[PDB]
Symmetry: D2
Subunit: 110 residues, 4 copies
């Protein structure tokens, strides 16, 4: 039951809109996923992203900048030494809170 939390948020911020519907970008070949873009990301803090590939923590990188349409791109090339991630691997993407370094899963591939 998550109404108590939702309205804890409404209490703090009356007007809020976000969209973390995952857009998985595919390089060449299509087998590989090389990016993830969110249509509308939270902007209260300059969040960072951590990527996990098949159980391997690829660490934290600087975020690409929120674009004027509110979207943000995570470029997996920046985390994976210049290579896409084969789509048979599970990919986890975390937001990292800059204040305490907390990590929250926001996207998962398979």
């Amino acid at each position: 039951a998550d109404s108590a939390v939702l309205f804890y948020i409404v209490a703090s911020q009356k007007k809020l809109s976000f969209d973390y519907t995952p857009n998985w970008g595919r390089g060449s070949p299509n087998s590989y996923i090389d990016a993830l873009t969110f249509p509308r990301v939270l902007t209260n803090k300059p969040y960072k992203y951590r990527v996990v590939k098949a159980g391997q923590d690829l660490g934290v990188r600087d975020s690409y900048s929120v674009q004027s349409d509110g979207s943000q791109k995570v470029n997996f090339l920046e985390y994976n030494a210049g290579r896409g991630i084969a789509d048979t691997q599970t990919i986890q993407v975390y937001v990292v809170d800059p204040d305490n370094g907390n990590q929250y899963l926001v996207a998962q591939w398979k």
Copy 2:
């Protein structure tokens, strides 16, 4: 409160809401007779409880969520057909139909 927001993101990828209060005024202008929210949450058919100057006016049935996402709370339905004099504090609570929990969403003075 980042931990709570992303708890919401975890369960609800895409969410938009707007409870910026639009205080309606009858005639005379001194009286507030309504409150309108531009875009309410719709996951549950919430209702509204109104407290006028510390007096609990109780719960009533919600007006319809309109096609633009808006929802109106008519204080005439809580205050026996009179607006609320703007010198009184007004508290509006959403009521959770599952457990009857109450959460403040708008406050006049």
Copy 3:
């Protein structure tokens, strides 16, 4: 819901509470006691009997052993409530007037 739990651990490193409802019965329910209530704010309680809002009353003191008792005689014009009906008990937040369910009978 682990994010929320550790949000609490974050704000408050050490915490113990116990709201396991001890109902006071022998067919009418005359009271409800909680072994260990939260004490960060002086909470009041609102009681609803079989859907009927009996409203808010002033709280009894938290006892030395951390317990607090809600006496339904103060809410129901001096009368117990028959187990027939569903009793809901809400904590009332004195800051904003919010209320959260914390106990239910049937």
Copy 4:
């Protein structure tokens, strides 16, 4: 934060925990009474450097759990000069929450 406190009260009506950091050169961190709803792991970060995750020691009968920094720092304690952050790791999603900090 009362709204969230009582949401926890709602989900579990009886609960006690104690994460007041017992620091023991700092070799280790002990928590008198950890949550046990999941089998949490811990991640350590030293002076900004991610030491990563290690398997957890068993929760003691008195509810306490010990994090041993020798397992995270290649057999060496951490000098109190540096800031140590300690995160619980949620085994379901891999989320991490800060639960202790040294300066």
